[PDB]
Subunit: 144 residues, 4 copies
């Protein structure tokens, strides 16, 4: 293992109309909880990016139901739910030449949970640990 | 007003490297809290989609700092943080021909907060109220 | 349905060094020509949007090779390859409130060929016929 | 920098009925020709990616009209308009581990012209020179 590196599902949603409901139905039937998701969409289709409670079980269920799914490495962090808090993290990263390809995040009461897909995963984790950023274990992320 | 309809900022992040840190710095300086965000990215640029604590103040600060920003109507909902919970909502919508253009969401302890951009905003809100889905007031969404 | 409407292939490229090559090798092995293509991408993977010489045959060959492939209706038009030619077409559409979701075009010597995916195909086609834009037959788009 | 590399305009289209028309009218009013274009879109707005006859002049005119416009390096190539021609180019790149972020191409009678944005321009150009692919000078891409 790699510890703080989490598996994100990327799921190709064809049609529009449709398939997103069936995907959430596949996952419900397996008692797989969704922790975090974000759709990256275009005019015709979406891609569901997804943090789930059991990514390997979820992946095989989806393939079995004929979905196109890929797994991507991402890292979860927690910071205070106050103005400028995320700003401080991103400034640590950018000062070290580590850039965000995408991220998604919500405030959760007093903190905020952030999923990141960094330009360089080894370097990103290095900086964050160095700057004493709360990283989430992949397993913490899967049980939000 | 329109009540449950919230303002989402969409912010054009040029470069890659960069500009996301400056945007979060603009917002920090105004003591504007981020509630929820999601980047919809391509190979060159991103678009930061953003739920903030004061969208009008945030919008004018960003324009003042020469960002390209647009506001979009979205609706926030809350459901249980259990398997199939989101599934039930989406099935209500799709049974009524209301489809999701995009959404993003995180589990927040015992519930989950979901931001939706529906195919039809008037119809989406109608179905959800009818099916007794917890909608979030726009103001609830801005203070997560 | 509509007259003139052509089948665009949308192929999930699961990424980023062929998979894409593999698509093009599957089509070449079938003696299927690419007339036009463009990739709509995010940070992790792309969607190849393609006009090909036989879309049903390409579909089958790509499905046989386990690609996720969808079909989308699009419309081909021609206009003079001169400044202002395309602008003149776009103004017909935008004055009748016809939105463009996406399009792709290249100058081809004396004409430009443009593939359009409008928000409403019915209204799009009506306005183009009415304003006498040169619509392509699907089979003319396929033989480029 | 590299030899052969051309300037692609990436224009924020803030949406979805011109704004796009307005871009094309700004360029036509400057007597600037579009050689190639494609829109990379999401549900709310698009990004127009364009090759034009004078990219610095188009940039200035679009900035003068308050568009958010960025410049990206891309590379133009030609290949025979026959099945397998493009596949042959893509296999050179993918065998040397060169990833394609996006590309767009149309068959132009006897050749196809392809605009490529690779993940690493240096390595891309090296492999194309070496394997003798027909690279376009920027000024040849601009005069299509
Ligand atoms: N509310 C915090 C943390 C946050 C980021 N995203 C969501 N919440 C901020 O403004 O940085
Ligand atoms: N955990 C819940 C709700 C949820 C949706 N997105 C994030 N959480 C489910 O599986 O539906
Ligand atoms: N070159 C023509 C038409 C065109 C659009 N795209 C490619 N060509 C113009 O500038 O209007
Ligand atoms: N038509 C050629 C080259 C091409 C790519 N795109 C447009 N044309 C092929 O099938 O390889």
């Amino acid at each position: 293992s790699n510890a703080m590196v989490a598996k994100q599902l990327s799921i190709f949603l064809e049609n529009k109309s449709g398939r997103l409901t069936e995907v959430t139905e596949v996952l419900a039937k397996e008692n797989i909880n969704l922790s975090a998701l974000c759709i990256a969409e275009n005019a015709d289709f979406g891609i569901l990016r997804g943090i789930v409670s059991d990514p390997d079980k979820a992946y095989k269920a989806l393939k079995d139901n004929h979905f196109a799914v890929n797994i991507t490495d991402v890292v979860g962090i927690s910071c205070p739910n106050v103005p400028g808090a995320l700003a401080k993290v991103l400034g640590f990263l950018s000062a070290e030449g580590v850039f965000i390809e995408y991220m998604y995040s919500f405030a959760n009461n007093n903190v905020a949970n952030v999923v990141i897909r960094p330009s360089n995963m080894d370097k990103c984790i290095e900086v964050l640990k160095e700057k004493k950023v709360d990283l989430l274990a992949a397993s913490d992320l899967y049980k939000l």
